Write a protein that binds this ligand. Structure first.
Ligand SMILES: Cc1cc2c(C(N)=O)c(N)n(-c3c(C)ccc(O)c3C)c2nc1C
Length: 281
């Protein structure tokens, strides 16, 4: 068994590793410092590299490829991540590879997720912090949207905090590229964060703007989003719930109304919000 590089630039398979030894390439070229997370996808470890001594994160699938479709779905994440490319507010992928039917993604190391930060804070985030995260996530989304890419999974768990109040959008596994001249396939998203038009099958960049709006609403007001039912509909009528949003400033409330616009024809784009006075810093 040997590891093979995974990339969608056409490269077939673009030191310190001995194929003869039984230990896998992941074990030979890294030291596992800690386990950042785990779930149905597999595991994420913090690691240090031996080629350049920098710190990285590695995500690995749980169990070997069931079939060609299972392999193709998992590898597509590498392809979607490459379409994003290098941008300051997007998690950067170093390299990805497969060995033993296991997929590995190596990225830069980032801090805790917005979700973890909010759980530890145990309350609504201070508004000043919220503006920074909103601005950086809008910049990430403006980058994706300018290339015809929709993230489809914007939420606190997929936003990663950095030093000095900055953050990065990550997890491009559900990313799709818009194209009536090309092709595409869509996976199931988190219903709590779903834009209303997705129910009727209309996909576009505006869905991400709605998801970010629900994301900011959740962390700025410490509010649990509903999966369905009347509460789910109440958030998609264009009216904010008065009880939770009371403490919010006029500027943030007004930005939230624009992002939560039910009609995707009328919803603000990321480029447009970033040109508003508060966000144009
Ligand atoms: C729990 C967790 C932490 C990190 C992480 C980090 N603390 O730095 C990182 N970079 N990812 C990551 C990885 C490893 C691959 C592709 C990708 O989009 C992302 C956002 C992480 N994922 C998870 C699930």
């Amino acid at each position: 068994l040997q590891p093979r590089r995974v990339s969608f630039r056409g490269e077939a398979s673009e030191p310190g590793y001995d194929p003869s030894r039984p230990e896998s390439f992941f074990q030979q070229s890294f030291q596992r410092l800690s386990r950042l997370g785990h779930g149905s996808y597999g595991e994420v470890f913090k690691v240090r590299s031996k080629e350049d001594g920098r710190l990285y994160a590695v995500k690995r699938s749980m169990s070997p490829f069931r079939g060609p479709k299972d392999r193709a779905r998992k590898l597509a994440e590498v392809g979607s991540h490459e379409k994003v490319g290098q941008h300051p507010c997007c998690v950067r992928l170093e390299q990805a590879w497969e060995e033993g039917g296991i997929l590995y993604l190596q990225t830069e190391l980032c801090g805790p997720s917005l979700q973890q930060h909010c759980e530890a804070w145990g309350a609504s985030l201070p508004e000043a912090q919220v503006w920074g995260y909103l601005r950086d996530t809008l910049l990430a989304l403006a980058h994706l949207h300018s290339q015809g890419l929709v993230h489809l999974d914007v939420k606190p768990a997929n936003i990663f905090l950095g030093p000095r109040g900055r953050c990065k959008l990550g997890d491009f596994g559900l990313l799709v590229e818009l194209g009536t001249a090309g092709a595409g396939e869509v996976q199931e998203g988190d219903p709590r964060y779903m834009a209303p038009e997705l129910l009727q099958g209309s996909y576009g960049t505006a869905a991400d703007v709605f998801s970010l709006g629900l994301t900011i609403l959740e962390v700025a007001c410490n509010m649990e989003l509903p999966h369905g039912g009347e509460g789910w509909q109440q958030l998609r009528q264009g009216y904010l719930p008065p009880e939770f949003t009371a403490g919010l400033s006029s500027e943030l409330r007004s930005v939230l109304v624009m992002m939560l616009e039910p009609d995707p024809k009328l919803r603000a784009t990321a480029e447009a919000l970033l040109a508003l006075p508060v966000l144009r810093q």
